[PDB]
Amino acid sequence: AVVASLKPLGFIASAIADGVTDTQVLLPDGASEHDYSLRPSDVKRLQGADLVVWIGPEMEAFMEKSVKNIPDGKQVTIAQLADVKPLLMKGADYNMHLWLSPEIARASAVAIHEKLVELMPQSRAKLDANLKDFEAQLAATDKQVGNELAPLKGKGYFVFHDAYGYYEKHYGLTPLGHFTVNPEIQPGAQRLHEIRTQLVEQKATCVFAEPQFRPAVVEAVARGTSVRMGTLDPLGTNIKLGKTSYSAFLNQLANQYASCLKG
């Protein structure tokens, strides 16, 4: 099997290795990328994976550990890829929420495909063809999203937790800023003040919760005000692995942003 660390890395691998081997996500639905640690049975899945896909040690900390035993032909480490490295952003030490960069996704699909062809050479036929389709969906989605999000350029909003840099920069969104960075921090207390003042001084159209964290803090700093409220799910927790899953992720996310920000 192809064992992906996070669900949207699954979405990608599931497209490339469709019909060739199954894909498996380690980080379960509704857990957060910051704050997991590998089950014994999750390490089994890694030890006997055909191919392992993850970002890199600055992101999925919890699995740097087990990935040192795995050799280079049996894994794809997306933060240290040829075409990705050059376009890593800074953390306002780089932002690693890469799985939302279509350019990076592309580069990842490529590298996955390469390694699978190597390991499973009698499936080259299908693999080559799965990839072609991916590149096509992905391209055609990047177009539709672009259009959907284009009218939200300018509209300022706030997000819980800083995950969306890559996506936001690429489609030209206009975030006023984030509540946290690591969302195991609260954050309080001045942070929450600076947001409040910004929201009541008109200035912001939407504020965005997340499903893997209590919206609790976001209602508040908003109640009373003319700010609308929504949610963003950066792990597409409610999307099934499949060919068209990663293109669905981006569309969903676009719709999440837009469903609140439209006007």
Residue numbers in the entry: 27 to 118, 143 to 313
Direct quotes from the study:
With a formal charge of minus six, TEW often interacts electrostatically with positively charged residues and through hydrogen bonding in protein structures. All residues could be modeled into the electron density with the exception of the His-rich loop, which is typical of cluster A-I SBP structures, where this region is disordered.
By this classification, SBPs that bind zinc, manganese or iron belong to cluster A-I, which is defined by two related α/β domains linked by a long α-helix. The ZnuA proteins of Gram-negative species primarily belong to group II, which is defined by zinc specificity, the presence of a long flexible loop rich in His and Asp/Glu residues, and metal coordination by three His residues and one Glu residue or water in a tetrahedral geometry.
